[PDB]
Amino acid sequence: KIKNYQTAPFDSRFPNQNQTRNCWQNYLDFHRCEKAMTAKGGDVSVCEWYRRVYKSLCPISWVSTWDDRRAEGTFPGKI
Amino acid sequence: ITAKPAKTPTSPKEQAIGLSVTFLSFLLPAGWVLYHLDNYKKS
Amino acid sequence: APDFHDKYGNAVLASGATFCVAVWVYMATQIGIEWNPSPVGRVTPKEWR
Amino acid sequence: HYEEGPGKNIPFSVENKWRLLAMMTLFFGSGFAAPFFIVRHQLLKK
Amino acid sequence: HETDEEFDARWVTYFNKPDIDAWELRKGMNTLVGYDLVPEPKIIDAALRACRRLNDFASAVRILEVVKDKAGPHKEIYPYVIQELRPTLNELGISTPEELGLDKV
Amino acid sequence: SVVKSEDYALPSYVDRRDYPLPDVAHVKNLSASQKALKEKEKASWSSLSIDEKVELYRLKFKESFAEMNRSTNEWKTVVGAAMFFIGFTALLLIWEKHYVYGPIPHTFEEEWVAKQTKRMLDMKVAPIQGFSAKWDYDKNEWKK
Amino acid sequence: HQTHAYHMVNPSPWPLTGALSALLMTSGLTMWFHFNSMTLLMIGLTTNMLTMYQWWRDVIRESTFQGHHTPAVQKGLRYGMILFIISEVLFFTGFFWAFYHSSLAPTPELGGCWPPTGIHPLNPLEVPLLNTSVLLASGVSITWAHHSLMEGDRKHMLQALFITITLGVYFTLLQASEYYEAPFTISDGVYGSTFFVATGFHGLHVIIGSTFLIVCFFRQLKFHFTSNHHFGFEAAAWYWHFVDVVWLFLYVSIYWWGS
Amino acid sequence: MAYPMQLGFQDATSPIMEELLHFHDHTLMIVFLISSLVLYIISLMLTTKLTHTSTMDAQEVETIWTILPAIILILIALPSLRILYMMDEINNPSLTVKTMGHQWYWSYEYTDYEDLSFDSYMIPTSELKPGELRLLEVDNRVVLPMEMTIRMLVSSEDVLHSWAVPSLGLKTDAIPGRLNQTTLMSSRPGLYYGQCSEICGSNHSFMPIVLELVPLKYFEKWSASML
Amino acid sequence: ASGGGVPTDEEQATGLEREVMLAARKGQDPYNILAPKATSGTKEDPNLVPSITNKRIVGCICEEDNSTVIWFWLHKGEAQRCPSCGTHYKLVPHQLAH
Amino acid sequence: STALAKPQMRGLLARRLRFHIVGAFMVSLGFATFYKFAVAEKRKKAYADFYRNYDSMKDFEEMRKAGIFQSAK
Amino acid sequence: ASAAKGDHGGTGARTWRFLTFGLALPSVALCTLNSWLHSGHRERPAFIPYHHLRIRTKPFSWGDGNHTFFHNPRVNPLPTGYEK
Amino acid sequence: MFINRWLFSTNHKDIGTLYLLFGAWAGMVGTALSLLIRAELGQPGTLLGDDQIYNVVVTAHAFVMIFFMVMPIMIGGFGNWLVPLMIGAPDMAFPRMNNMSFWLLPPSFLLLLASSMVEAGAGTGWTVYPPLAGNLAHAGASVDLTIFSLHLAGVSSILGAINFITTIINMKPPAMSQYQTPLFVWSVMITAVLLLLSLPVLAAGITMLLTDRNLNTTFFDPAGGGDPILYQHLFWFFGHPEVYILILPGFGMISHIVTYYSGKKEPFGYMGMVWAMMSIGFLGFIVWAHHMFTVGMDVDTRAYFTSATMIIAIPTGVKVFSWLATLHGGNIKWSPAMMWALGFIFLFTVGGLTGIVLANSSLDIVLHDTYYVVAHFHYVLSMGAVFAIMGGFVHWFPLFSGYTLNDTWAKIHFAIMFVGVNMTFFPQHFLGLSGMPRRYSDYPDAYTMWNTISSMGSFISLTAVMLMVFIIWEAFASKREVLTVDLTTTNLEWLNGCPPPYHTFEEPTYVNLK
Amino acid sequence: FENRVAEKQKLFQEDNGLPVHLKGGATDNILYRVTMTLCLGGTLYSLYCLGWASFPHK
Ligand SMILES: CCCCCCCCCCCCCCCCCC(=O)OCC(COC(=O)CCCCCCCCCCCCCCCCC)OC(=O)CCCCCCCCCCCCCCCCC
Ligand code: HEA
Ligand code: HEA
Ligand SMILES: CCCCC/C=C\C/C=C/C/C=C\C/C=C\CCCC(=O)O[C@H](COC(=O)CCCCCCCCCCCCCCCCC)COP(=O)(O)OCCN
Ligand SMILES: CCCCCCCCCCO[C@@H]1O[C@H](CO)[C@@H](O[C@H]2O[C@H](CO)[C@@H](O)[C@H](O)[C@H]2O)[C@H](O)[C@H]1O
């Protein structure tokens, strides 16, 4: 419920030309949430908004490289 | 500003030469490289 | 005694101008330099598809 | 005690105008020429 | 800084100094040509008299030339100035640049 | 009378509008008759001739104001020499073209430009002022 | 012949040999970085050492032995030193900027935090702190040196100098040992990069500074200094203090705050 | 795109760009004012025999030549800044597109719903269809819906490049590890061109941008077809 | 002992430094380190300008605060005057080296 | 014949500048004003005029039939 | 604080020497002490092949091109891991 | 004798002479480089057929014009010649270090040429931004060579700055205060200050670029959490001041020339000229990010930098106006130098005016990295800095040498140059407005006409350079010896005759306190 | 040590026409020539390297 999704909205935590942290935060936020909702089980569609936002905003090569590194055990972000 | 007359006058003929030589020293070697540009390309 | 410019000024001004105008105009219009002027009021468009 | 006066405070001679001419012409000419020859040099590295 | 009439009288006083010397003469004229003005006849008259005391004709004439020069494109100034100095010129035997032929190239 | 390079720290003669009375006289040494003339100067200037008055002026000054301000014909020479070397430059460009530049791309051929102009008008390049605004679509020709 | 008080300097080969040695060093570095050879470098280094030796020897000859250093001359030297120091400040600034630029906006590739993920900083209360005391102490003893010299006491001057020099050396050894012991390197990202380059150049200056001190020691042994004219010494002290203060700033920025 | 013998800016295709045109007219008007003025006075100073060569008082006139420029500067900055805060102002965009620089081409990602991406390469001159533009054409154009706000995110996978579309008033550097945002809106349908604007190597001159501006309807069908 | 061992300038100063030092003790300025003080610079009271040759360059700052200095050669002989302000200067010979 | 009237002899140079400064300001202004009427205002009108009639859908459609698009035939 | 002690009416080298021996050197001896009893085992950190560390974009131009100047086998792993 | 005099010199005049010689020569190289640029652009298509080489030629052109022609001529050349002469100094503060300042140049220059000879040269632009400038995109020695060249050029100017400041503060007569010193002397001092503060920042940055290339640091490398934007900060932190360094000694000489040939004893508003130079110096350090309006800084930072940049027009305005005011009422001598000076005042104003247009971050979005920039800066460098060089060289030539130039020839020279530079750079404004990128080896066909006219003007300028050489030869060949110079009472540097003896001011000037 | 400054003062003020960098005697000379030799040696060497490095080695 509430998605109705077109593209990521304006987000006053990231108000400037530089949008790097926005992609990054959302990647983090997506995966933290996924963590929580799996060391409990069931649905992750609570986290789904985060997936949609960073999907829209991160370049693919960034997302895949990060994805690799999570699997690799070399991802430098606290999840 | 004032000056003595030339110690060693450079006549019109002499100027003509000085001038012609100066130009050629600039033009020839570049004209050369430029003219052969093509003999350098496709490699 | 009249100076270099009293004697030659008028010849130098005259041939200088002449030689200059001639050769530029020659150069501008006669050796195939492409200027690519605005086609407007110059070129008749043609079907490209 | 160095030489002082016009034509004496420069590291080159102006005693002969024709020698002066050859000198200047090598000097300025070498400078102008070089980028033409560097470009050449680079095209022939190929 | 002072008025016109003060300035004029000051320069007249300057050129009237009975034992003015050559250096002082040149200094006065060289300074005077610095200003945005053509100097009043009263001053010129003073300065030429000074030439007479220093026994120096050529400078009197050179003074006339600068008067004309400082007028630039105002051709009316110089003939006025001569008109006014005419008794001093006649009294002292001073010829004008034009009278001497020094105005032609 | 002769000026020497080593007199540089001694006062000099100059002819300048704005320095009408220079620091030394033009002629410094007098011949016999010239002394006699400077003697006459100590007398009434009425007594002097016009020739004599010119002389005294010449001993004092090199050039008269009229002389020192004469115009000249130099500008002619300058303008004409400039145009000459400018005309001369065109020779280099003529050379360059002939011996150095190769054929320009086929997109300059006339057929190419005509078709390309058309496409430009189809896609309505600068329709407000620059390019397309100058074409009459209804009459299918350039606006007069 | 002169009635001003300034020094007209004998023609000298050393500008030219310095310039050449600059060519050799940069050539050599290039050679080393790209062709694995060190010969040119060695040459450049030698000739540079030789130029420095002779040029400063002649400065000494000109002043201690020939008396060209009039007060006017000395006033000039006071300015040149100060300026040279100013330029060294701006240089280090560039590295401080780099540190602060990175550590304030930590990128995602570092895990978005400072210090980065995987980096374990040295503890600023351990050797960094001792280092800090060793330089601050030398600041004191050098000042004791200076007062001794001015009051004309040879013995104590020498004693104070020696102590300042020993402290400098100490610093240098602790610092080498820290380098060996550190669990991160220069190739460890922008952390290692900023850390090793800033402390590096600083370490280089502590050396240069120490060298300058030893030179003054020897000139002092040899009675070159009067109780009133000893510019070689004042220069070395200013430089020393500069070295000191840069250290403080590194310690506050990199070791402490950036830990 | 530019046409032969052009003098000023390409026609505006967006609001912001139209706004800059008028701003530039403002500024250029002031430029002519000042330089004609300087020209006139220079020649006023040089065309009289009259002299005044003794010393002159600074005070009075130095004021005029300080206060005037300051006024003029304020007349320039005022509108300049307005426009700058405007090129920034709170957007509400309907779409996000990423562009990524590469030596030497651009790739584009449209990842709001599907995972669509493609490479845009210059058409070689030997392969131009007649009517086509030398060094400006691309095999794959950037199809966007006209008349809507779009977020363009720009970055690079290698060196610096710069993504520009002059007639839209767009220019944003492409910096590796960095995501720069710009905002795009066309008033018209059409084809609008730009070129890499940061030296990125030996083929700098050859990695153009071509946007194809069309109605939502077409844009959707097109994107489904590019999956 | 907290004795000496450091030489003093008086003992150890040499060449020109030493000249400047001694000279100063007798209040003399042979190496032109201090600014001379104008007199009234009239004909009776000229500015006296020491020199080892027959000419020296004077600079005359005609009035305090002038941005422009007037430069000229002063020659041995009768006093000369600043071509700008009129003040008098006279050359006086050697006596920094008779 | 008859005497010449005494003319103006002071501040000729300044007289000349008073006069011409005014010239210089006007000339300078004119130029600016010219650019503003002949270019700037013209430009606002061009834009204004153009969009008033404009129909983006008809624009598009014309472009479509002329075959310019990859996405729309 | 802008003191804790005091001086100015008599002095010189003597005062500064008092500070060398009285405060400066003793602080060093303290900091040295503090360090004697903090040395030893830095628990060698576990190795993770993080991509932002152990950077190699060019071989170093000494050794085997892969060791850093002050390499320490005990604490400085290579890009492939610590050493044998 | 030759070696002692010319390789071991400690004499300010001779050394200044060596700079004039070194600078002219580099000038010939820069010119050639510019003509290559314009040959390539002169018709559509490709001439060199290699764009890495185009990029190299462009990069070398800028390094050569800036570090090897302007700075040595203006600072090293006229600065050494004229500064001591204008203050009554017997030489510079540090004569020997002075000589090393010069000798570091030819080796520096040698390295620059080498960089273009090995591998594929350094085709990076003179800004040398990474990653393009880094060890992947520019692998091998070329970039490293370039860095070292800047290192030696940097040290040169650093030691020089120190020497100029010391000499200017410490070696004036005791009676003369800084407020009695010629404006050229101020202009050098202020410039020396900017050199001192800015070069070491450059030096630090390129040092970081070196280590990222050769020691596996990651200062500018996102992979290691570094940032390329950081490099632009440092470069431009040095870079904007750099531009003011290039023009200030020019302002200084224009002031002397305009006064001299106006028959004036001093410039209008001396203290306002001082003020104006200092303000430019100061402001010149707080505006660097306007070289970065397109990198994605925030809007507020951008609004600050537009605003601070604009402010420079004010103290610059005062100078322009004071020059005009100095002409007012002058006895004008139409000398060749005077003609350079007039041209400068006008052309520089135009260049400065297009700078103002650029200062607006709003417009610069569309103007950054186009020919509009190139147009702007060649107006301020090639008709700014250069015109002052030509002006100063024809004015002081007889003093350096003892001989006179032929005035008619010099006037013919000026005329030709005037036409060439305008025809070169004027059309390039249209190229920028219509949006042609900077640094391109070819261009879409629309842009042809302007580029053609541009390249055409560039040849006309070449004809001037060629005539200039002949003009210098004619003077040394004919040997017209100077006798009298006007206006020495306010132009101290002429007082020792032409050329002045090896040692001047052995007995210093006499100046009263009062 | 002992104070020998006066002695060195005498030697270096000795009116022999030599420049300061040669007034030490024979040692100065040796040292000077060595330096000069390495500088010109080194430069020649580098020209050679520059040259050699300017051509590709395949
Ligand atoms: C510095 C000297 C220059 C000389 C150089 C020689 C080389 C040859 C160039 C010979 C050129 C002669 C100079 C005329 C100036 C024209 C300005 C202009 O067209 O401006 C318009 C805009 C274009 O904007 C538009 O989009 C509207 C276009 C107008 C509609 C009609 C379009 C059809 C063409 C109409 C023809 C108009 C005339 C232009 C025709 C094109 C000319 C090539 O371009 C721009 O911004 C251009 C950027 C220039 C900014 C620098 C300012 C310099 C100040 C000079 C002092 C003035 C005192 C005169 C004092 C007079 C002194 C002579
Ligand atoms: C001599 C060198 C020089 C000088 C003096 C200047 C002077 C100025 N420049 Fe320029 N410039 C360069 C050389 C120089 N420039 C170079 C080489 C580059 C390119 C670097 C690169 O990318 O390669 C560059 C780039 C550059 C940019 C970057 C644009 C971009 O890259 O995208 C900007 C913008 O802010 C700028 C602005 C200015 C300004 C405001 C001045 C001002 O100082 C000008 C001040 C003067 C005046 C304004 C005229 C006189 C004043 C009056 C008559 C008073 C009245 C005026 C008004 C009321 C406005 N210049
Ligand atoms: C001092 C600085 C300077 C000077 C003088 C010039 C002079 C010229 N420049 Fe300049 N140019 C730059 C600085 C300069 N340039 C810089 C910084 C760049 C940026 C590069 C980059 O992107 O990295 C650049 C870029 C640049 C481009 C950019 C091209 C591109 O982006 O691809 C072009 C193209 O036309 C160009 C052309 C010319 C021309 C034709 C001349 C000249 O030929 C103009 C005529 C002037 C002369 C020919 C000089 C004469 C002077 C002497 C001969 C000295 C002698 C003195 C004595 C004997 C006393 N330059
Ligand atoms: C105790 C401090 C003394 C250190 C100095 C001693 C070594 C010789 C170098 C002298 C140059 C001085 C320092 C400047 C260069 C940077 C070195 C940084 C300091 C340092 O030495 O960092 C070390 C790396 O050393 C390395 O690469 C060493 C590689 C050395 C190569 C130097 C390359 C030359 C670059 C300098 C030229 C730049 C120009 C400078 C001035 C120009 C301005 C005009 C750290 O070792 P590590 O194994 O990574 O980590 C520890 C792991 N346990
Ligand atoms: C930006 C710089 C501008 C440069 C402008 C150059 C102006 C022209 C100068 C003369 O250059 C010469 O021209 C000849 C061409 O006419 C060339 O000879 C070539 O052609 C001749 C006749 O066609 C043959 O005799 C020769 O063998 C053949 O080498 C010759 O090498 C070249 O140096």
Short mmCIF file of all heavy atoms in Angstrom, two decimals, chain H residues 24-34, chain J residues 28 31-33 35-36 40:
data_model
loop_
_atom_site.label_atom_id
_atom_site.label_comp_id
_atom_site.label_asym_id
_atom_site.label_seq_id
_atom_site.Cartn_x
_atom_site.Cartn_y
_atom_site.Cartn_z
N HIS H 24 21.18 37.16 -20.80
CA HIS H 24 22.44 37.45 -21.51
C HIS H 24 22.32 38.73 -22.29
O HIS H 24 23.31 39.49 -22.40
CB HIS H 24 22.86 36.27 -22.38
CG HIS H 24 24.02 36.56 -23.29
ND1 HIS H 24 23.88 36.71 -24.61
CD2 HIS H 24 25.37 36.76 -23.01
CE1 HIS H 24 25.08 37.00 -25.16
NE2 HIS H 24 25.99 37.01 -24.18
N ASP H 25 21.13 38.96 -22.86
CA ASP H 25 20.79 40.23 -23.50
C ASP H 25 20.98 41.39 -22.51
O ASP H 25 21.61 42.42 -22.83
CB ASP H 25 19.34 40.21 -23.99
CG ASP H 25 19.18 39.53 -25.35
OD1 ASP H 25 20.18 39.24 -26.04
OD2 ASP H 25 18.01 39.32 -25.72
N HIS H 26 20.48 41.20 -21.29
CA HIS H 26 20.68 42.18 -20.22
C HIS H 26 22.15 42.48 -20.10
O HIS H 26 22.59 43.63 -20.19
CB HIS H 26 20.12 41.62 -18.91
CG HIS H 26 20.19 42.59 -17.74
ND1 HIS H 26 19.59 43.81 -17.76
CD2 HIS H 26 20.76 42.45 -16.46
CE1 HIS H 26 19.79 44.42 -16.57
NE2 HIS H 26 20.50 43.58 -15.77
N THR H 27 22.94 41.42 -19.96
CA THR H 27 24.32 41.60 -19.60
C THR H 27 25.09 42.18 -20.74
O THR H 27 25.94 43.04 -20.55
CB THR H 27 24.93 40.25 -19.16
OG1 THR H 27 24.15 39.74 -18.08
CG2 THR H 27 26.36 40.42 -18.73
N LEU H 28 24.76 41.74 -21.94
CA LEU H 28 25.48 42.17 -23.12
C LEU H 28 25.17 43.61 -23.38
O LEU H 28 26.00 44.35 -23.94
CB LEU H 28 25.08 41.34 -24.32
CG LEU H 28 25.95 41.53 -25.58
CD1 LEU H 28 27.41 41.21 -25.28
CD2 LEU H 28 25.41 40.67 -26.71
N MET H 29 23.97 44.04 -22.96
CA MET H 29 23.60 45.44 -23.16
C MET H 29 24.56 46.32 -22.33
O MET H 29 25.17 47.28 -22.84
CB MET H 29 22.13 45.65 -22.82
CG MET H 29 21.73 47.10 -22.56
SD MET H 29 20.08 47.28 -21.82
CE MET H 29 20.15 46.22 -20.37
N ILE H 30 24.76 45.91 -21.09
CA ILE H 30 25.73 46.59 -20.23
C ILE H 30 27.16 46.55 -20.75
O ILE H 30 27.86 47.55 -20.70
CB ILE H 30 25.64 46.02 -18.81
CG1 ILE H 30 24.39 46.60 -18.15
CG2 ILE H 30 26.89 46.37 -18.00
CD1 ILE H 30 23.83 45.81 -16.97
N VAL H 31 27.59 45.40 -21.28
CA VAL H 31 28.91 45.28 -21.93
C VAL H 31 29.12 46.34 -23.04
O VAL H 31 30.14 47.03 -23.04
CB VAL H 31 29.23 43.83 -22.41
CG1 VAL H 31 30.41 43.80 -23.37
CG2 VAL H 31 29.55 42.94 -21.19
N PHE H 32 28.16 46.47 -23.96
CA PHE H 32 28.28 47.49 -25.02
C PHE H 32 28.36 48.89 -24.44
O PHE H 32 29.25 49.68 -24.83
CB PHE H 32 27.14 47.41 -26.04
CG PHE H 32 27.25 46.23 -26.96
CD1 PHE H 32 26.15 45.42 -27.19
CD2 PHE H 32 28.45 45.92 -27.58
CE1 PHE H 32 26.24 44.32 -28.03
CE2 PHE H 32 28.56 44.82 -28.42
CZ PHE H 32 27.45 44.02 -28.65
N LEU H 33 27.46 49.17 -23.49
CA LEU H 33 27.48 50.45 -22.79
C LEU H 33 28.88 50.80 -22.31
O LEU H 33 29.50 51.79 -22.76
CB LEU H 33 26.52 50.47 -21.59
CG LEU H 33 26.53 51.85 -20.90
CD1 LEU H 33 25.52 52.76 -21.58
CD2 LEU H 33 26.24 51.81 -19.41
N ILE H 34 29.40 49.95 -21.41
CA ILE H 34 30.73 50.19 -20.88
C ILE H 34 31.82 50.28 -21.96
O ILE H 34 32.61 51.23 -21.96
CB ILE H 34 31.05 49.22 -19.73
CG1 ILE H 34 30.30 49.66 -18.50
CG2 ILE H 34 32.50 49.29 -19.34
CD1 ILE H 34 30.00 48.55 -17.52
N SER J 28 27.00 56.50 -25.46
CA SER J 28 27.11 55.25 -24.72
C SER J 28 25.75 54.64 -24.43
O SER J 28 25.52 53.46 -24.72
CB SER J 28 27.85 55.48 -23.42
OG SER J 28 28.26 54.25 -22.89
N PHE J 31 23.68 53.46 -27.88
CA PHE J 31 24.15 52.09 -28.13
C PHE J 31 23.46 51.00 -27.33
O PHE J 31 22.95 50.02 -27.88
CB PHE J 31 25.63 52.03 -27.79
CG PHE J 31 26.52 51.96 -28.98
CD1 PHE J 31 26.77 53.09 -29.75
CD2 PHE J 31 27.12 50.75 -29.33
CE1 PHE J 31 27.59 53.03 -30.86
CE2 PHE J 31 27.95 50.68 -30.43
CZ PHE J 31 28.19 51.82 -31.19
N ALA J 32 23.50 51.16 -26.02
CA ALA J 32 22.81 50.27 -25.11
C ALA J 32 21.32 50.22 -25.46
O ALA J 32 20.75 49.13 -25.63
CB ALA J 32 23.04 50.72 -23.66
N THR J 33 20.69 51.38 -25.60
CA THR J 33 19.24 51.45 -25.87
C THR J 33 18.89 50.81 -27.20
O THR J 33 17.83 50.19 -27.36
CB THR J 33 18.76 52.92 -25.84
OG1 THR J 33 18.87 53.40 -24.51
CG2 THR J 33 17.31 53.06 -26.33
N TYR J 35 20.55 48.33 -28.66
CA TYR J 35 20.61 46.90 -28.48
C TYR J 35 19.30 46.44 -27.81
O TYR J 35 18.73 45.39 -28.15
CB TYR J 35 21.84 46.48 -27.64
CG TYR J 35 21.91 44.97 -27.56
CD1 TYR J 35 22.49 44.22 -28.59
CD2 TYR J 35 21.34 44.28 -26.47
CE1 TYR J 35 22.53 42.81 -28.55
CE2 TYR J 35 21.37 42.89 -26.41
CZ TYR J 35 21.96 42.17 -27.45
OH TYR J 35 21.96 40.81 -27.43
N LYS J 36 18.82 47.22 -26.85
CA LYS J 36 17.61 46.81 -26.14
C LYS J 36 16.33 46.83 -26.98
O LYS J 36 15.48 45.95 -26.80
CB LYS J 36 17.43 47.58 -24.82
CG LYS J 36 15.97 47.73 -24.37
CD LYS J 36 15.77 48.17 -22.92
CE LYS J 36 15.45 46.98 -22.03
NZ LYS J 36 15.01 47.39 -20.66
N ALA J 40 16.70 42.91 -27.90
CA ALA J 40 16.26 42.31 -26.69
C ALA J 40 14.75 42.22 -26.70
O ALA J 40 14.21 41.12 -26.62
CB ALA J 40 16.77 43.11 -25.51
#
